[PDB]
Design an enzyme around this catalytic site. Sequence first.
Site, PDB file in Angstrom:
ATOM      1  N   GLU A 114       5.433  10.636   2.968  1.00 32.64           N
ATOM      2  CA  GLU A 114       4.199   9.855   2.855  1.00 32.64           C
ATOM      3  C   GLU A 114       3.941   9.126   4.164  1.00 32.64           C
ATOM      4  OE1 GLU A 114       1.691   9.689   0.085  1.00 32.64           O
ATOM      5  OE2 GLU A 114       3.121  11.353   0.092  1.00 32.64           O
TER       6      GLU A 114
ATOM      7  N   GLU B 141       1.972   2.000  -3.570  1.00 36.14           N
ATOM      8  CA  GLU B 141       0.909   2.632  -4.334  1.00 36.14           C
ATOM      9  C   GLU B 141       0.959   4.156  -4.199  1.00 36.14           C
ATOM     10  OE1 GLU B 141      -3.131   1.471  -3.185  1.00 36.14           O
ATOM     11  OE2 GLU B 141      -3.923   3.159  -4.374  1.00 36.14           O
ATOM     12  N   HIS B 142       1.317   4.671  -3.007  1.00 34.96           N
ATOM     13  CA  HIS B 142       1.452   6.111  -2.782  1.00 34.96           C
ATOM     14  C   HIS B 142       2.661   6.658  -3.540  1.00 34.96           C
ATOM     15  CE1 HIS B 142      -1.272   7.104   0.769  1.00 34.96           C
ATOM     16  NE2 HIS B 142      -1.411   5.785   0.632  1.00 34.96           N
TER      17      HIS B 142
ATOM     18  N   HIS C 114       0.830  -1.190   0.000  1.00 34.81           N
ATOM     19  CA  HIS C 114       0.000   0.000   0.000  1.00 34.81           C
ATOM     20  C   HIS C 114       0.874   1.252   0.000  1.00 34.81           C
ATOM     21  CE1 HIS C 114      -2.499   3.119   1.930  1.00 34.81           C
ATOM     22  NE2 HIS C 114      -3.373   2.660   1.028  1.00 34.81           N
TER      23      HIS C 114
END
Lengths: 55, 438
Positions: free
Chosen positions: B122, B52-53, B49
């Site tokens: 992030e 994905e960022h 995940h």
Amino acid sequence: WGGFSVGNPTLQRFFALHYLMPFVLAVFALLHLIALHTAGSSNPLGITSNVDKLS
Amino acid sequence: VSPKTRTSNLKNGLTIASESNPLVQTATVGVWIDAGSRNENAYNNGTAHFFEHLAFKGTDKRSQHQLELDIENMGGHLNAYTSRESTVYYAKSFKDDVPKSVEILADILQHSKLAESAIDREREVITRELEEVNKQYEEVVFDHLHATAFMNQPLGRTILGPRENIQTITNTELRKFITENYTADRMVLVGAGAVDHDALVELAEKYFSHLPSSQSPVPLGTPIPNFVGSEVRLRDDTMPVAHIAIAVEGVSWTSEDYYTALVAQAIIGNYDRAVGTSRHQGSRLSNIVSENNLANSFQSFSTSYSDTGLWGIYLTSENTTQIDDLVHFTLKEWNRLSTSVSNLQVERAKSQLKAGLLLSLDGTTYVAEDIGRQLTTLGRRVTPAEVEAKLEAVTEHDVRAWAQKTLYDKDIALVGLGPIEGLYDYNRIRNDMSMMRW
Ligand code: HEM
């Protein structure tokens, strides 16, 4: 006694009342449970159990 | 009769699969990957995940800003999602902007910077996501449902991962993840809408030819889950609506009972008080729930994975003193899949599904999602004629036999969120999984 000492009249009346009294006892046993149902059972810690009930 | 799905391979083993529609002017191209959170261990849970960022945070050529501009100039958009077993990266564009979009997708997958500065930035964004999922009650309920049903197993982990991992994910482990998992034999380049297959194969040869192949190429959609009957209660008296999910272990994509489980699911079906037609639905549970105001909604589901699944129902209700009735009547309807269903319910559900499986695919993104899902779970796109034949093969005996081994007297995983004081303890719920009269 139904007389001047314990005898036949006493025995026959004790039979009739001994048969009846357990039915009276069952009614009072039911009454004390209906009275209890407003608060529910207490518990060994003495605190409310309204936070955590089991069926 | 829909156009045929064309399928080609490259040398590395990348599949290209396309379905053209000359009536639309947009196209969805993207990359479906047979990889997701379930490929992480406990230490790097959250990596997929996290990537994905970062995929949108800049590549070796285009910086973050250049990337933004390039997509803005294309005219369409890019989108991505990571699940437990699947990752998707796609681009919806105009017909003639397809070569640009393939080039951008190839770039962000192969040549992403994963710069320590961006990892660090992030790391806070994702940390904030941990405290805001809390609002999406359906997601909260289903993530707890997976966590408990597959207790301490990879399918039980969340996609975001624990807070601890978010603070310790390095560019090294990100790179390692995508090098091990994003291999050509696990990837499908999909095009739907105004795409030419032969054009898309050429673009794949141009951009995705230097993809690593895995050492041991297994077929697409190749996987041991041990379901735990269990419950999570997240009582919150301040919420007005209770959200409850109940599930048993269901079926994998390639189970022989896959269609039987879908038909059984359609016999219970869905309900929503806000939709006008829902008070008139044929489902018995629908009728009980609507007549007695037991729920705002319920939604039957049959979720599949490569080697297991979850089959169950998700309920929402404000009727907090009759949650017991709601759960009772729902599980007594499940009992009837074992004891009572006949050709009446089965043929009605089959009729509804024969259309439903085709109706779902009503736009290029849905078509692309269907080609990508089927290619990464089954290794092939199953034609509607084959699907119509597998549904027709489902009899009432099949449904009864399936329910008797899957539902009847079985453990459930149960999650309740909100004002759930009226939801009884595990035993009383699980006792409704059978009927003493039968
Ligand atoms: C025929 C005789 C009796 C029967 C069948 C009976 C039955 C019961 C039952 C079934 C309960 C609820 C469960 C339990 O706590 O054990 C209870 C509670 C209670 N009984 Fe009795 N009972 C009887 C006699 C008595 C007597 C003689 C007393 C008092 C002198 C009494 C005072 C209570 C009280 C205060 C409670 C509530 C206790 C609590 O849960 O905290 N009962 N009884």
